[PDB]
Structure formats: structure tokens, C-alpha cells
Design an enzyme around this catalytic site. Structure first.
Site, mmCIF file in Angstrom:
data_model
loop_
_atom_site.group_PDB
_atom_site.id
_atom_site.type_symbol
_atom_site.label_atom_id
_atom_site.label_comp_id
_atom_site.label_asym_id
_atom_site.label_seq_id
_atom_site.Cartn_x
_atom_site.Cartn_y
_atom_site.Cartn_z
ATOM 1 N N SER A 171 0.838 -1.202 0.000
ATOM 2 C CA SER A 171 0.000 0.000 0.000
ATOM 3 C C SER A 171 0.873 1.254 0.000
ATOM 4 C CB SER A 171 -0.962 -0.020 1.193
ATOM 5 O OG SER A 171 -1.933 1.003 1.075
ATOM 6 N N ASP A 406 -9.114 -4.390 -5.940
ATOM 7 C CA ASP A 406 -8.598 -3.724 -4.759
ATOM 8 C C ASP A 406 -9.296 -2.362 -4.610
ATOM 9 O OD1 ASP A 406 -7.122 -2.388 -2.773
ATOM 10 O OD2 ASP A 406 -5.254 -3.385 -3.341
ATOM 11 N N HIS A 433 -7.595 -5.717 -0.398
ATOM 12 C CA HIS A 433 -6.459 -4.830 -0.470
ATOM 13 C C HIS A 433 -5.202 -5.542 0.007
ATOM 14 C CE1 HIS A 433 -3.941 -1.329 -0.323
ATOM 15 N NE2 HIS A 433 -3.905 -1.302 0.998
#
Length: 463
Positions: A171, A406, A433
């Protein structure tokens, strides 16, 4: 770094001094916190991870990652997590809000976008910004950006005694990744980036792609739930957004949007509209949480909000004694210096107009013609980075792992990052995610082969 056993493995802990300002390498100094899980076999080097956020603890993440780490990786690598400057156990840590500050915000519906509403929000924001400055001082805040985290990472590389960095970022850790790769390309042994941040994106279009991601993850959850007995959203997914609003809108007084009418919980707070929305977003990170979302919605039908409130606390990092960690405060501070903030009110107003159309499940009432500026429009220090296409010509090939649905970092962001990095794209078909070291033996095999052998997934690899 002087290592020591810790306060759950053969883990060792230590600190690493870095300068707050790298142009004053003799001034104020920060101390980064590190955790280390010694390799069990023949050591190639350290695998350094970062969970993202920003504001999330790399130490805490390495402890989780340890549990799901493939046998061969754990044999060949020290697993190493770190807390970036300003985050968790690193000193000085970023703090702005007290525990009471955070609760008070979360009690509000946060939904009134009339002129008075917007003025209220922007007043709370200014008070927040002032609390940041008063507790941290302007100098530390000006240097918590990714550009300086990247430099610490090279200090970490060196202090672990590796000639080249082996790195896994999730991320936001993806942005640390590309930043390190641009300043120290000749120091990258290997790099896996899962759930991609594309540093060349327009911030508004990114936000809108993100809103679309969660609506799409919402549609996916609802369609799944609709096959299941007693779905709280009904058996017809084309009507799930409306049913969902019939459940959350009563949490707001219909005659006055500033008034919360919270669902009853055993916790004293009850469940506000904004916490209801936050808990929903939390659950749409992973289908592992879909059951909890469904429970939470079912509780709403009976005017209860205990599960949605716990999901919001997971998102907000509030433990069961009402204490927050500093991820929220750190998140904002770091995001504010990583890029120029949107300051044009008209663009923020038009984004709101579009976001309501794109992610209706998150949207209450109708477009008002006004919307608040974000916290970063009021930041007192200037950005230390700015949107650009990643350029790291000499860079070793890397792997970008991107999931087709995602919600937080959409698939196409990963495609773009891979292109700019001219590395390998590995696709995961799912609605979640991130995915690396989280169960899928396929993904983990590819990633294990890349980490040890250097072998990249074939063009078009799917898992």
C-alpha cells in the site's frame, strides 16, 4: 544498532539514530525502532517490510508477517520491520489529538455540507493543525515525508549490514519503495510492491478512483451476501445501496444533519453515522471481514451498532481502554508533506459532486454546492515531494502485485507503477487490499522464487 531480545520469536530489537534534517546532519536527531527475526538457514540478507498507511507500525506488521512467512523465505532471510520517523515506537512520535479529541470527532455525523457545516469542519481542522504544530514544532513536521523515509531506509540497509536492500512494501509502503528506487537504484537487490501507489497520479482523480473502488467492493460484498440466508441488504443487490441507506441514514437526525441519533451499543458511545461508514470501509478491505459487516448490518436492523463500532475502532486503532495509537496523526502529517495539497475550493466542490455519483453508498443526502477543504489545505509546512512519473533507469527488475478489485489501491494503479518501473506485474483476482504472505500459495510461490532466485513472474501471470 545494538540489538536486544524484545519486550514471540527469536526476535531482536534495536534503535537507529538518523538526522531529522539531512541538510543539518548535526542537529536534531530521530531514533527509529527496529525488529529482527534471524534467518533459520543460509542467510542471503534481510527482508525489510513496510505495511503502509502511512502511520502503521512496521514492527507490528513484521510480527504478523512472521506468522504467515513461507518456510523458505524464513530460512534465507532475516525478517525486519521498522517504525518510520514519527511513527509508533520511533521517537519523536507524531501526536496531535488526544483520545478525547478523536472520540469527539467520531461522535459527529460529519455529513452536513452546508456553509455552516463546512465552516464547522474547517474550524476543527484548523484546531487540529494548530495542535500538531504545538506538540511537534514545525521543523520535525517538515521532514517526516517519504523522501526522508527513503534516506533512513538506506541507513537501515547499511546498519543491517546488507550491501543491497531486499524490500517488501504494501500500500503506502509502495511509495517508500519507488522513492528508495529513485534515490538508491544501485542499492536494490529485490523489491516487491503489493497494492500500488502511483506517484504520478492527480490526487483528485486518485481519490475518485478510490471511491469507485469501494463502491465496486461494496457491490461485490452485497452480491455475495444476497446468495446468503437473511442478507441484511436484501436478496436483490441492485437495491443494496438504497437498503444500506435505510439502515444508516436514521443515525442522522432528518431535521438537522449536525445531530447524531446513534444506534445502541454496550459501549457508551453508541454508533454514529460516520463510524458506521468507517466500519463499512474497514470491512471492504478483505472478504475475511464480510461476515462482520453482515453482522453489523443485521444489528442495525434491530437498532444496534456493536459490530460496526468495533470495525470502526479497528480502522481508527482505538483499543478497548479507549486509547489510540498515533497512526491517524502520523497518517495525516506524512500525507501532507508528500504532495502539494488541493487548495482550489471549486475543485474540492466538484470532486464531491462526482464522488456522490460514483460511491453513493458513502454519500448522505444530496449535493449541496459546498464541500470542505482537506486537512492538508491548511498544512503549515510545504510538500517535500510532488507527482511525477517514476524514473529509475538502472533499476533491477521488480514485482508489482495488483488485485483486480482492490478498493484502496485499484488494479490500474499497479499496472501504471509496473510500467513506470518497467518491472513485472503479477495479478491477483479478488476483492481485497493486498495479498502477499496472506494465504494464497500461488502468489507466495512466485514471490518466494523472486526473492531467492531473482526469477520474475511471466508476462500475464495471474494467481
Amino acid at each position: 544498532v545494538e540489538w536486544t531480545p524484545c519486550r514471540p520469536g527469536g526476535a531482536l530489537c534495536g534503535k537507529l539514530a538518523v538526522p531529522v534534517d539531512y541538510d543539518r546532519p548535526d542537529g536534531d536527531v530521530a531514533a527509529l525502532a527496529l525488529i529482527r527475526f534471524p534467518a533459520t538457514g543460509d542467510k542471503i540478507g534481510s527482508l525489510v517490510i513496510n505495511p503502509g498507511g502511512p502511520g502503521e507500525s512496521g514492527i507490528e506488521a513484521a510480527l504478523g508477517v512472521f506468522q504467515t512467512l513461507p518456510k523458505r523465505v524464513h530460512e534465507r532471510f532475516d525478517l525486519v520491520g521498522f517504525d518510520p520517523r514519527g511513527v509508533a515506537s520511533s521517537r519523536p512520535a507524531i501526536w496531535c489529538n488526544s483520545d478525547a479529541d478523536n472520540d469527539r470527532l467520531r461522535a459527529e455525523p460529519q455529513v452536513d455540507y452546508s456553509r455552516e457545516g463546512v465552516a464547522h469542519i474547517e474550524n476543527e481542522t484548523k484546531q487540529f493543525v494548530g495542535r500538531c504544530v504545538d506538540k511537534m514544532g514545525k521543523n520535525f513536521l517538515a521532514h517526516v515525508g517519504t523522501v526522508n523515509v527513503a534516506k533512513d531506509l538506506d541507513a537501515i540497509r547499511a546498519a543491517l549490514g546488507d550491501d543491497k536492500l531486499t524490500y517488501l512494501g504494501y500500500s503506502y509502503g509502495t511509495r517508500i519503495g519507488s522513492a528508495y528506487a529513485e534515490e538508491f537504484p544501485q542499492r536494490v537487490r529485490a523489491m516487491i510492491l503489493d497494492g500500488a501507489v502511483d506517484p504520478n497520479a492527480d490526487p483528485i482523480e486518485a481519490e475518485l478512483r478510490q471511491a469507485k473502488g469501494f463502491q465496486d467492493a461494496f457491490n461485490n460484498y452485497a452480491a455475495d451476501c444476497a446468495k446468503n440466508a437473511g442478507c441484511p441488504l436484501g436478496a436483490d443487490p441492485a437495491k443494496a445501496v438504497e437498503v444500506y441507506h435505510s439502515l444508516v441514514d436514521p443515525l442522522v437526525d432528518p431535521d438537522n444533519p449536525r445531530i447524531s441519533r446513534p444506534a445502541r451499543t454496550k459501549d457508551p458511545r453508541g454508533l454514529s453515522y460516520s463510524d458506521a461508514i468507517v466500519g463499512t470501509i474497514m470491512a471492504l478491505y478483505s472478504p475475511n471481514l464480510w461476515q462482520h459487516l453482515t453482522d453489523g448490518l443485521s444489528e442495525l436492523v434491530d437498532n444496534r451498532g456493536d459490530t460496526l463500532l468495533a470495525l470502526a475502532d479497528m480502522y481508527m486503532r482505538r483499543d478497548s481502554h479507549g486509547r489510540y495509537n498515533n497512526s491517524g496523526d502520523a497518517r495525516v502529517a506524512i500525507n501532507c508533506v508528500d504532495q502539494p495539497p488541493v487548495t482550489d475550493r471549486d475543485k474540492v466542490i466538484d470532486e464531491d459532486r462526482r464522488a456522490r455519483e460514483i460511491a453513493p453508498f458513502m454519500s448522505y443526502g444530496k449535493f449541496t454546492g459546498d464541500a470542505p477543504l482537506g486537512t492538508c489545505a491548511f498544512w503549515p509546512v510545504p510538500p517535500t515531494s510532488q507527482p511525477h512519473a517514476v524514473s529509475a533507469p538502472g533499476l533491477v527488475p521488480t514485482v508489482v502485485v495488483s488485485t483486480t478489485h482492490d478498493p484502496a489501491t485499484p488494479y490500474k494503479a499497479g499496472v501504471d507503477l509496473a510500467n513506470q518501473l518497467r518491472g513485472s506485474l503479477l495479478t491477483f483476482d479478488g476483492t481485497q487490499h493486498t495479498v502477499v504472505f496472506q494465504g494464497d500459495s500461488c502468489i507466495d510461490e512466485y514471490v518466494t522464487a523472486y526473492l531467492i532466485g531473482g526469477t520474475t513472474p511471466p508476462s500475464g501471470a495471474k494467481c
